[PDB]
Amino acid sequence: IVGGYTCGANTVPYQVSLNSGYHFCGGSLINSQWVVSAAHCYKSGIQVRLGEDNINVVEGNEQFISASKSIVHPSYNSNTLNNDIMLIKLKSAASLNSRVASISLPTSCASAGTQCLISGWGNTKSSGTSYPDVLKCLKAPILSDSSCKSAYPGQITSNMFCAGYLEGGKDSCQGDSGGPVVCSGKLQGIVSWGSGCAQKNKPGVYTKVCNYVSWIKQTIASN
Ligand SMILES: CN/C(=N/C#N)NCCSCc1nc[nH]c1C
Ligand SMILES: [Ca+2]
Numbered sequence: 001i002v003g004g005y006t007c008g009a010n011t012v013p014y015q016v017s018l019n020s021g022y023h024f025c026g027g028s029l030i031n032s033q034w035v036v037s038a039a040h041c042y043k044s045g046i047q048v049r050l051g052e053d054n055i056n057v058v059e060g061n062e063q064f065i066s067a068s069k070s071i072v073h074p075s076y077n078s079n080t081l082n083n084d085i086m087l088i089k090l091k092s093a094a095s096l097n098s099r100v101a102s103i104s105l106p107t108s109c110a111s112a113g114t115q116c117l118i119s120g121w122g123n124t125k126s127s128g129t130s131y132p133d134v135l136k137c138l139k140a141p142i143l144s145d146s147s148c149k150s151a152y153p154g155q156i157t158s159n160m161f162c163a164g165y166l167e168g169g170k171d172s173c174q175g176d177s178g179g180p181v182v183c184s185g186k187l188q189g190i191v192s193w194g195s196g197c198a199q200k201n202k203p204g205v206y207t208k209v210c211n212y213v214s215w216i217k218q219t220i221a222s223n
């Protein structure tokens, strides 16, 4: 997260770190046994880390649970990033509490202007590189479809929305991938892609989760 603030330990209790020897992607807990992330975060050997603030220090609220099953969206295209969504089933149910909690799926799609909370352990600099160890937060509005398409001509599908600031300075970045965009207690987005981070007229591009709710519920019900 560039131009954000320190969330505060366990204030984003649905935020997960995906770990393969190191944090490499975020995710969102949507029930005791399932995480939503980006398809582009897919790899084997995933350990899901919940109750995390400092990902380099055991602080006392962590649950470390291995993935049993990953499911990349059937229609994921790694070239266009269309349908950038993946489900991870945990080997055991997470123990749910104030610091480890599922986030609600949307019943309706969110609209441009809706303020959202974007979070992750990604890079904090526009130019150069510094990884925070504690979770960073950004309040960002959803941008209009027309702005998003003007910013990235030829690239924005019906499964994508822009959120952030066309003036730049405030964005998601490298390592925030797969992480949540929450708007009024609902998971409306997944950190998917962008052009650099926090550049003028190059806002963050998010997976539009409301399009995927029936696939998510169907998949959970049979897996
Ligand atoms: C992560 N999504 C973003 N939000 C915004 N801006 N940032 C876009 C670039 S981040 C770095 C990168 N680019 C390709 N692969 C990787 C890991
Ligand atoms: Ca920790």
Ligand SMILES: [Cl-]
Residues within 6 Å of the ligand: 144, 145, 146, 147
């Ligand atoms: Cl529009």
